[PDB]
Amino acid sequence: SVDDKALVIGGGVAGIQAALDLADMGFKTYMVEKRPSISGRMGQLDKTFPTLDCSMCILAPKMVDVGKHDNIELITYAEVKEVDGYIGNFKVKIEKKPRYIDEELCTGCGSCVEVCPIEMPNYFDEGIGMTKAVYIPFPQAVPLCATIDKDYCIECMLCDEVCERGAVKHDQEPEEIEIEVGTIIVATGYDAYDPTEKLEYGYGRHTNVITGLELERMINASGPTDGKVLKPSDGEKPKRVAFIHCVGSRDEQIGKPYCSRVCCMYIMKNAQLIKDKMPDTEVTLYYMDIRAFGKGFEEFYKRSQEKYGIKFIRGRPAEVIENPDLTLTVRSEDTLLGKVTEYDYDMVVLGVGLVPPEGAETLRQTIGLSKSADGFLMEAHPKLRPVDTLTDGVYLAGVAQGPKDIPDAVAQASGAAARAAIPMVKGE
Amino acid sequence: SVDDKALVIGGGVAGIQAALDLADMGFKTYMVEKRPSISGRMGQLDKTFPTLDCSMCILAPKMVDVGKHDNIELITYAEVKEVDGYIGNFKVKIEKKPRYIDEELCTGCGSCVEVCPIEMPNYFDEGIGMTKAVYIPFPQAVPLCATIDKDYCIECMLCDEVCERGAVKHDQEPEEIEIEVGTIIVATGYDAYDPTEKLEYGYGRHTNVITGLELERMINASGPTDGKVLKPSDGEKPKRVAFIHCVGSRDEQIGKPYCSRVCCMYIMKNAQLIKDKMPDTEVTLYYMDIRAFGKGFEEFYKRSQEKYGIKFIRGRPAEVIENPDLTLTVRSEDTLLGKVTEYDYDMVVLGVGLVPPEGAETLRQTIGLSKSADGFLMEAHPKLRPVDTLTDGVYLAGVAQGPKDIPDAVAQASGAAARAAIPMVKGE
Amino acid sequence: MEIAYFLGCIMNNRYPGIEKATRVLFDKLGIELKDMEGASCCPAPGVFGSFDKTTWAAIAARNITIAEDMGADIMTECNGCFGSLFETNHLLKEDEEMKAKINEILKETGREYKGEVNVRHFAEVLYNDVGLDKLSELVEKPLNLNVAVHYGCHFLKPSDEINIDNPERPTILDEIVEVTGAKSVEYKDKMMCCGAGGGVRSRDLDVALDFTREKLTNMKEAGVDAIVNVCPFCHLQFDVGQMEIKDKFGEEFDIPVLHLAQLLGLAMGLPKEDLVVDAHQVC
Amino acid sequence: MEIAYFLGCIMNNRYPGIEKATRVLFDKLGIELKDMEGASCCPAPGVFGSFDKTTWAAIAARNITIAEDMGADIMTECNGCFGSLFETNHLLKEDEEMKAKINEILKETGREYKGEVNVRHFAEVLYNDVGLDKLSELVEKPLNLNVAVHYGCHFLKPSDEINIDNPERPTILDEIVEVTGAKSVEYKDKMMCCGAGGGVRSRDLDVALDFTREKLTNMKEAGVDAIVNVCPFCHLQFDVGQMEIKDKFGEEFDIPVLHLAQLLGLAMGLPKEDLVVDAHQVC
Amino acid sequence: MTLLQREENIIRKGNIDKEFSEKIKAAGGDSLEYCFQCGTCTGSCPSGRRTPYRVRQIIRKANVGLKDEIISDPTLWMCTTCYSCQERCPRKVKIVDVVKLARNEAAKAGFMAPAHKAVGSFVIKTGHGVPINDATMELRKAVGLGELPPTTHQFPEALEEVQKIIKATGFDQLIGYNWETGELE
Amino acid sequence: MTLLQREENIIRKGNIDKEFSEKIKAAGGDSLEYCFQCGTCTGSCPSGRRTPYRVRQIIRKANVGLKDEIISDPTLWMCTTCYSCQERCPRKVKIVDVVKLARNEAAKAGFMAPAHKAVGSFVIKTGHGVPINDATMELRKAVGLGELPPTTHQFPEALEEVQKIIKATGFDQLIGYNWETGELE
Ligand SMILES: Cc1cc2nc3c(=O)[nH]c(=O)nc-3n(C[C@H](O)[C@H](O)[C@H](O)COP(=O)(O)OP(=O)(O)OC[C@H]3O[C@@H](n4cnc5c(N)ncnc54)[C@H](O)[C@@H]3O)c2cc1C
Ligand SMILES: Cc1cc2nc3c(=O)[nH]c(=O)nc-3n(C[C@H](O)[C@H](O)[C@H](O)COP(=O)(O)OP(=O)(O)OC[C@H]3O[C@@H](n4cnc5c(N)ncnc54)[C@H](O)[C@@H]3O)c2cc1C
Ligand code: SF4
Ligand code: SF4
Ligand code: SF4
Ligand code: SF4
Ligand code: SF4
Ligand code: SF4
Ligand code: SF4
Ligand code: SF4
Ligand code: SF4
Ligand code: SF4
């Protein structure tokens, strides 16, 4: 006997695709997402390589479809606490964290946000954007509902008095949900590598050194800078920008011997977008290999050079020095000139890699899955079962199985939907 | 109304996976394959990167499953001639070429092969292996049936006299099959780039210059050399081997501006396999970028250096010169030493890229699909619909959509199965 | 058929045998060679092109206007002069602003470049307008010679613009040569430069001679009897540089150097006097 | 406690003030410094390690056996000597064949390396065995001094083997220095080599002095009053090289060079004569 | 001899002339913007095999803007313009055009060999880079050709037109030709 | 002056000593087998900024086997062994060990500076690389320390033990020390 219900863990593009494929196939599907809204990392991007098309424009309709699908039960701001049983017979225990806002009553109008006096970081802005203690992470959020962070709320009750739907509930408590499913699809995505430990590059010490994901937020028109790339030091545009490849990847000094597989492309994309916004900006990339392996990627690389005049230096930088004026000198060999260079820049962007998300180990142990040498989840067979696991009834989709771009993750999510549907169609 | 039957075109790993996923989901599936047996290029490989596991060992069970599945009708040695209609209502006309052997009676014993006096090249051996005018492409063929090539048969009738099942039919005629299906999955794969036009590298003129796929056949234990890497000139092992990357790819002089995405990895794999078979052999790779982007790939690259002592030269070779003794001098800059090198080798292997298969244009026009810039089939949306096409009811799987490795193709095949099943489940 | 005849410098001023053989050959073929009165250095691309593009282009454009006034295409027997004139012609035809600048310079001379004629190589004219059959008919004595064909560089390259034959493995010169009964012998690095182009012969004679010495070693190991070229610049490099190599390193290859016109004349029974071998430093 | 005291060459033969300050300091701390009678050059890794690994290792192993006989750990206040002795110790302990070879060489001397003692740096001993609180207690006069701390390369590197502090951004020496009331001033390229290691000072004095001049420029722009080091090799480079730079290029930095022991003695109210600043070329 | 050299072993903004790169690109070398430094050009180069000339590095420096390093480089004059590199470049860079533009800049900077100036002066005086001599005059006479070819050697007006072009383009000033004395400066 | 140089501008098998690479790897430089030439080492190198010394290229040559090019290279002696490169190498290559092994081979080939030999001879004669002088004897006396440190300066037997070690390892012959005369030759 195989229960004909599915659980999808994670609300990124991979989880969204898996859930929509399962629901369109007729299976009732739960989706558990730990953030107040689905979207994952794709919703944070401004544009996507290699087309430079807007990510939100194409992701938001799918998020809406998820939020309105008859066969999908969306549980945001929640986490899987326990998993027991086996294929077709999984008992799952989920803990819905308290929003202190009534999801059924909140319309997401935002008045409570306007009236709140307490400012706090917005997780969606990756440490460079502010919001209020009561917030909506981004205007396209699904569900379009508010959330109160109690570590910052001072219980002023202004939000309570400004809301008209009576949606504010300061007395809300965490809720325990128990569900029964036949299959599980883990689509928990990734986190950007934190380069603070790369002391020679100076992240967290030098003012004008940022990560690629922070740059994504700054370029984004809905970001905290209204889409303007500005120096953190003074709030002015940088005349000179350097990008550094392979930060947090291909590096045994930090125990990260793998390639993060997307950094080269998003580096080139961000460089092109900077040039598009500010044609006078000089942009330079320090790389080891340009890995433009995907469909149209090599053409994207050529275009980075021919069309936008982006400079490529083959050399892994030795150091980033902050000057007194807060400009940055990158000290690096140009291995093709065979000489040491010390070039000055107004901003330096670290091409951070991809790592397993915070809390990956806890969920891995809850389900009982194995992990690969790079810390991501291990598939049943690397050649012929990329989305299966040796735990029957549990499948992998997206960067949960390892670093990769959006189309590869989407293909994996569709495949996992198929593989999970097979046992559920069989019924036993 | 949507017919609940599917057609899968191509019998490679992608087509095999798509067909098995659809059949296991309960839909009746036709598979059409132009070669006498399914397997595609995967069945030609000896081992697979990054694990060096045997390709046939893991592919053959799936081929058997396809050949015995109740929900799959396998039509090998056949081609789709016409496609009419639309999603859920496709009328397809297939032409089964005459084997001159009765598929129902042939047991694949091989006696006819032993008795035939006419030798001809075996397509499965990629131009370096011989068989008879009546042949079985490889021992794991599905169906395990003979085929007579009439361009070489002299009608001696020895095969008729030796066969005991009465399976030889010299009077067989091509057969027309008409089927009705609701969806189509194009999984037609690729062909290795032919480097004859790269005159400076000398393929087809220099005796000891071979392609990567030829090397796959020579390495394979069931290949025409019994798995021994032998110089074509004299049939002895090569003491020195060079590999050249990006042959037929990343090259505007031949109108191939894309990266073939797998050649770096299979180059390193075959170098490692050569070292394993003959530890004394010296192996050198001429590359531009090492694109070891996949899971475990960067580790595979490191291992190529640390464990096997494979030498890496960053330089795109200018020329390959054949010496009087038939050794080969590779003339190339070492860009990291910044100097021209002329190194001698006993064999040179061209890392040929991937191109659309012969006859791709005809099938594309028959179905009515669009092609991308690189000549492969165009998906409906490069980010969010990688396996769909703008022609409703037609989907893409595997290298048909563009160069990629086995796990990516398998994920695409599973995804295409899901996407095709959705309309068929809906029924309208 | 009529065609303007550009001579250059080296053929008309150091090796007039090439000019005489060409004139006799084209007279035998029914092609009217019309002199380009007042023509100058093409000018040689190696020096002038390296020094000032505008001067090189203006001088070449004046040379082209001579033929334009004569109303005929230009035929050149020199790879160097062909490269210079052909490049200038297509540059001025494909670019209006540069044509305006060059014509502004030329206005002082009373001339105006119009872009009305084509520049053609001697070998291309022979191969296409005459054909191998007619050349074979004119042979009076098949030659028992093993020859090393030196294509030169500016006959076929840049191939994108010239589009005469495949630069890596051409056959046109080999076929013309074998029409005479001589055998074109393959040798190592056959397509390599002679070292004289780009001003290198005058800038660094030792480097250019090293090119020539490498080529001569490869030809000698192939056991050829003579070198055949379609470039008086390459002709001079091989001829004089064999003497220079012999005098500098004491290595003598003693391989005769023949222009393709001279080889054809030898096969066509031309008088020995007409072939001015007295000009050749290598006997 | 007790610890064997290795002196090296430069401290005992050019700057005995460092030795005297060390002896007085350790006497105040209740740590018995036991002489390593018959000790030689460690030997200096730059020359001996570059010339012959076996000779370097054998001499260092003899130095280590001197302490092994006393059954005490070795304390060195020289980065160079620490690097040499520590590397030799961990090489012989972790490799049996090399230990056998070195002991075979040592048979003549009548000694045998056993791998029974540890090699420790002066700063590590101060930081771990004593601690910042006791050092702060022993301070009699806080110093009003802006100091440029020169770590020197072989104190912390290779960090995989030494594992004392983070080589990129260490703090141990800075904390010890600030215990005295002096301020450790950050300056550009603070972790850069002084240029004297690896034999460079003796092989190419100009290159090593260029290292020192770059470092001195960076220190001067930071407005420091003195340099503090834990290496008599670095001490000599800075001290003598300031004079050499003044003589060669006329640059006048005039920045005093103090070993960490001398700084601690100054903060500890030791007699001025015990610092033996008469040895310093820079006043 | 010391190995110390504080300017030759490091690249800073002070070694870079951006206007030089822009001028080269605008004059027809724009394709240099997009080579990916594969080294096919250097591998094909016959001069690279016997001199320190490295065409790939010339292209690299042109992209970076190291004007002083390029134009003062003697190896720049080792290129014979054989075009082999340009025939093989996978990014279709117009290498020979870049080399010639760099050479034009070098000549403008005064890096002209005396022999090349001698060729220029021969063209100025006679209209031929290789003027005829007496032995060839008599040899031409022997075979029935004219004593002089129908070139600027025969027609003074043609030489006057060539000299007018040379004056108008300033080429006489580039090589330091003195018209009054007919000698080089 | 001609730029022609037939042997310095091309690498063939004749420039390669494979036994040299094997000897270096077997002696503790095996990690040089697997750098991917990222150039972090050169970027970190303080000597690379002011001399022609390029550590990445030394590692590359060691891998290729260009023994004669390495051991005869003066720039090989520009490394101070600061270890910065080795601290940052992403492939964890033991760069300094490779440099020291190459230096040992160079010394065996006779590429030893006279000053380094002088240091060796000082150690042979006195057991100290930097032996004491009169002024320091006076300062040691004045500051309460002994006139001589308790080292090979004080104990002749210790000096004889050091000299026995030097004889047994052959170091005296490496630097050409003559025991009878006490000089270098
Ligand atoms: C700077 C940058 C730029 C990029 N640009 C591009 C580009 O241009 N084009 C492209 O194709 N790709 C790009 N990528 C790659 C792309 O981001 C990924 O391929 C894609 O986001 C993977 O989606 P996913 O759904 O697998 O994971 P994610 O996007 O990480 O989504 C995972 C979801 O799961 C949730 N989750 C995590 N843990 C739990 C848990 N325990 N319980 C419940 N929910 C959980 C997360 O909160 C999130 O909602 C880029 C990546 C980066 C870092
Ligand atoms: C030398 C080499 C080594 C490789 N090594 C590896 C490796 O180690 N690991 C790895 O993961 N990947 C490897 N790859 C890549 C791998 O081969 C592909 O990812 C994989 O084969 C794609 O399978 P497919 O089913 O999409 O296409 P294919 O394998 O090409 O199969 C397509 C099938 O369709 C059939 N077909 C074609 N046209 C028609 C038609 N008109 N009608 C009917 N049938 C048709 C073909 O005959 C064939 O049976 C390698 C590739 C090469 C060239
Ligand atoms: S809590 Fe009330 S005011 Fe705030 S978004 Fe929801 S409905 Fe609007
Ligand atoms: S009660 Fe909390 S969330 Fe509401 S307005 Fe006050 S601080 Fe903000
Ligand atoms: S994708 Fe590019 S930048 Fe990212 S780790 Fe791989 S090589 Fe480095
Ligand atoms: S045709 Fe007959 S002999 Fe040949 S394989 Fe089939 S059954 Fe065997
Ligand atoms: S009839 Fe044809 S296939 Fe059969 S044995 Fe004869 S040649 Fe072979
Ligand atoms: S995968 Fe590697 S070998 Fe193949 S085209 Fe791309 S870079 Fe070249
Ligand atoms: S061949 Fe072309 S792409 Fe390659 S380095 Fe030379 S100019 Fe650049
Ligand atoms: S054109 Fe110049 S750079 Fe290019 S191959 Fe010829 S000589 Fe070398
Ligand atoms: S840093 Fe390490 S991997 Fe990079 S070039 Fe230097 S030795 Fe090789
Ligand atoms: S150890 Fe030598 S090569 Fe490495 S950074 Fe220091 S000086 Fe440079």
Q: How far apart are the first and last CA of chain C?
A: 36
Q: Out of F11, F37, F57, name the one closest to residue B314 (CB).
A: F37
Within this chain, do residues C234 and C113 fall inside the same structural domain, yes or no? no
Q: Which of E44, E94, E130 to probe by mutation at the C interface, max C CB count within 10 Å? A: E130
- Give the ligand with the smallest distance to the CA of F102: 12
Contacts of A315 in chain F (CB under 8 A): 38-39, 43
A18 is in an annotated binding site: yes
Q: Judge if B64 and B181 occupy the same domain.
A: yes
Choose the final residue of a domain: A353, A375, A393.
A353
**Which residue of B lies nearest to C160 if distances are taken between CA atoms?**
B253
Instruction: Mark whether F100 and F123 lie in a shared domain.
Output: no
E26 and E81 co-located in one domain: yes
In a domain, B371, yes or no: yes
Q: In this structure, which amino acid lies at residue B389?
A: T
Could you tell me if residue F7 is inside a domain? no
Residue F8 in domain = no
Number of folded domains that form chain F: 2
Residue A159 in marked binding region: yes
In a domain, residue B17? The reply is yes
Residue to substitute from B196, B197, B198, B199, interface C, most C β-carbons within 10 A? B199
Q: Are C108 and C162 found together in one domain?
A: no
Do C157 and C85 fall within a single domain? no
Q: Quote the DSSP letter at residue A103.
A: T
Torsion of CA D198, D201, D204, D205, to 10 degrees: 160
Same domain, F70 and F119: no
Question: Does residue D34 belong to any structural domain of this protein?
Answer: yes
Domain that holds residue D7: 2-122
A320 within 8 A of A201, measured Cβ to Cβ = yes
Sign of CA dihedral C162, C163, C169, C171: negative
A144 close to ligand 3 (CB < 6 Angstrom): no
Q: How would you write chain D as a 3-class SS string?
A: CEEEEECCCHHHHCCHHHHHHHHHHHHHCCCEEEECCCECCCCCHHHHHHHCHHHHHHHHHHHHHHHHHHCCCEEECCHHHHHHHHHHHHHHHHCHHHHHHHHHHHCCCCCCCCCCCCEEEHHHHHHHHHCHHHHHHHCCCCCCCEEEEECCHHHHCCHHHHCCCCCCCCCHHHHHHHCCCCEECCCCCCCCCCCCHHHHHHHCHHHHHHHHHHHHHHHHHCCCCEEEECCHHHHHHHHHHHHHHHHHHCCCCCCCEEEHHHHHHHHCCCCHHHHCHHHCCCC
Residue in B306, B312, B344 closest to F13 by CB? B344
Q: Is residue F135 part of a domain?
A: yes
**Domain final position from B353, B385, B405:** B353
Q: Which of C87, C122, C157 represents a domain boundary (last residue)?
A: C122
Domain range holding B234? 192-353
Q: Is residue A402 part of a domain?
A: yes
Domain final residue, candidates E52, E86, E108 = E108
Write the residue in E9, E49, E51 that is nearest to F52 by C-beta: E9
How many Å separate Cα F88 from the centre of its chain? 22
User: Backbone dihedral region of F123: left (phi > 0), alpha (psi from -120 to 50 degrees) or beta?
Assistant: alpha
- Identify the residue whose C-alpha is closest to ligand 6 atom 8: B109
Q: Best interface-test mutation with B: which of E38, E47, E49, E86 has the largest number of B CBs within 10 A?
A: E38
Domain membership of residue E101 (yes or no) is: yes
Q: Method used for this model?
A: cryo-EM
Domain CATH for C212: 3.40.50.11810
Residues A40 and A185 in one domain: yes
Do residue B44 and residue B27 come from a single domain?
A: yes
Question: Are E20 and E104 found together in one domain?
Answer: yes
Buried b (16+ CB within 10 A) or exposed e, A256-269: bbbbbbbbbbbbbb
Q: Are B347 and B225 in contact (CB under 8 A)?
A: no
Q: Report yes or no on E90 lying in a domain.
A: yes
Environment class of residue B221 by beta-carbon count within 10 Å: exposed (0-12), middle (13-18) or buried (19+)?
Answer: exposed
CB atoms inside a 10 Å sphere around CB A166: 10
From chain A, the residues in CB contact with F43 under 8 A are: 315-319, 331-333, 340
Known binder of ligand: residue F45? yes
The CATH number of whichever domain residue A84 belongs to comes to: 3.50.50.60
Asked if D168 lies within 8 A of A200 by C-beta distance, the reply is: yes
Strand runs labelled E in A271-422: 282-287, 311-314, 319-322, 328-334, 339-345, 347-352, 354-355, 394-396
Within a domain: residue D128? Answer: no
Residue B16 counted as domain residue: yes
Which atom from ligand 10 is nearest to the alpha carbon of E86? 4
Of B47, B405, B414, best ligand 2 pocket probe by most atoms within 8 Å of the beta carbon: B405
Contact B321 C188 (CB under 8 A): yes
For residues A153 and A146, what is the distance between their CA atoms, to the nearest angstrom? Answer: 13
CB contact under 8 A, E12 and A342: yes
- The pairing of strands B5-9 and B183-186 is parallel
- On whether the CB atoms of residues B302 and A257 are closer than 8 A, the answer is yes
Provide the residue range defining the domain that includes F95.
13-108
Please tell me whether the peptide bond between E74 and the residue prior to it is cis, using omega within 30 degrees of 0: no
- Chain F 140-179, residues with CB within 8 Å of chain D CB atoms: 140, 142-145, 149-152, 154-155, 157-159, 161-162, 164-166, 168-171, 174-175
Contact F43 A338 (CB under 8 A): no
Any bridge partners for residue A333, and if so which? A340
Place of tokens 């030498």: B311
Q: How far is A324 from chain B (nearest CA, A)?
A: 35
Within this chain, do residues C86 and C189 fall inside the same structural domain, yes or no? no
The C-alpha angle with vertex B103 and arms to B102 and B106, in degrees rounded to 5, equals 75
In a domain, E6, yes or no: no
Residues B248 and B338 grouped into a single domain = yes
E145 and E73 both lie in a single domain: no
Instruction: Kindly give the number of the ligand 5 atom that is closest to the alpha carbon of A288.
Output: 7
| CB < 8 Å to D46, chain F | 80-81
How many cross-chain Cβ pairs, A to B, lie less than 8 Å apart?
177
| Residue E18 counted as domain residue | yes
In chain F, whose CA is at the least distance from the CA of C204? F2
Ligand 7 near B133 CB (within 6 A) = yes
Which of these three, E71, E86, E108, is where a domain ends? E108
Interchain contact D122–F (C-beta under 8 A): no
When divided into structural domains, chain C yields a total of 2
Q: Do D195 and F130 touch (CB under 8 A)?
A: no
Give yes or no: residues B346 and B252 share one domain: yes
Partner-chain contact A298 B259, CB within 8 Å = yes
A186 and A246 both lie in a single domain: no
Residue that terminates a domain, selected from F108, F128, F147: F108
Domain boundary among D80, D101, D122: D122
Is residue F183 exposed (0-12), middle (13-18) or buried (19+ Cβ within 10 Å)? exposed
Q: How far is CA C196 from CA A107, B117, C238, E104, in A?
A: 82, 60, 9, 19
Shortest distance between the Cα of B199 and any Cα of chain E, in A, equals: 11
Does some domain include residue C127? no
CA distances from D148 to B389, D145, D195 (A): 68, 10, 17
Asked which of A300, A329, A353 is the last residue of a domain, the reply is A353
What's the gap in Å between the CA of A283 and the closest CA on chain B? 21
Contact between E120 and C51 using a beta-carbon 8 Å cutoff:
yes
Question: Which residue from C minimizes the CA distance to F6?
Answer: C210
Residue B58 within any structural domain of the chain = yes
Residue F100 alpha carbon to ligand 12 centre in Å: 11
Quick check: is B148 in a domain?
no
The answer to whether C166 contacts B199, with C-beta atoms less than 8 Å apart, is: yes
DSSP string, F47-116: TTTTSS--HHHHHHHHHHT-HHHHHT-GGGGG-----HHHHH-TT---HHHHHHHHHHHHHHTT---HHH
Q: Do D111 and D140 belong together in one domain?
A: no
CA distance D41 to D43: 4
- Do B293 and A297 lie within an 8 Å CB cutoff? no
Residue of B nearest to A23 (CA): B422
Q: Which atom of ligand 1 is nearest to the CA of A397?
A: 26
Q: Is residue B218 part of a domain?
A: yes
F 69-88 near A (Cβ less than 8 A): 84, 87-88
Chain F CB contacts of C206 under 8 Å are: 2, 4
Contacts with B354 (C-beta within 8 Å, 6 or more apart), sequence order: B190, B191, B192, B193, B249, B260, B261, B262, B263, B399, B403
B362 and B336 housed in the same domain: no
Query: Do residues C149 and C113 share a domain?
Result: no
| B17 C-beta neighbours (distance < 10 Å), count | 29
Closest Cα in chain F to D54: F169
The CATH number covering residue E56 comes to: 1.10.1060.10
The residue whose CB lies within 8 Å of the most ligand 8 atoms, and thus the one to mutate among B249, B298, B304, B350, is B249
Same domain, F96 and F29: yes
* Nearest-CA distance E10 → chain D (Å): 14
Per the CB < 8 Å rule, is B374 touching A338? no
Contact B340/F10, CB-based, under 8 Å?
yes
Asked if residue C105 and residue C223 are part of one domain, the reply reads no
Q: Are A361 and A332 members of one domain?
A: no
3-state per-residue secondary structure call for A8-75: EECCCHHHHHHHHHHHHCCCEEEEECCCCCCCCCHHHCCEECCCCEEHHHHHHHHHHHHHHCCCEEEE
SS3 B332: strand
Q: How many domains is chain B partitioned into structurally?
A: 2
- In a domain, residue B145? The reply is no
Query: Do residues B45 and B216 lie in contact, with contact meaning Cβ atoms separated by under 8 Å?
Result: yes
* Amino acid in the structure at residue A316: R
* Same domain for D139 and D113: no
Q: Is B261 in the pocket of ligand 8 (CB under 6 A)?
A: yes
In a domain, C133, yes or no: no
In terms of DSSP bridges, do strands B175-181 and B90-96 run parallel, antiparallel, or are they unpaired? Answer: antiparallel
Which numbered atom of ligand 4 lies nearest the CA of A115? 5
Domain contains F2: no
Q: CA of C168 to nearest chain B CA: how many angstroms apart?
A: 7
Nearest CA to ligand 10 atom 4: E85
Omega within 30 of 0 (cis) for the link into C43? yes
The contacts of residue E166 (CB under 8 Å, 6+ apart) are C55, E123, E124, E172
Asked whether residue A311 falls in the same domain as residue A380, the answer is no
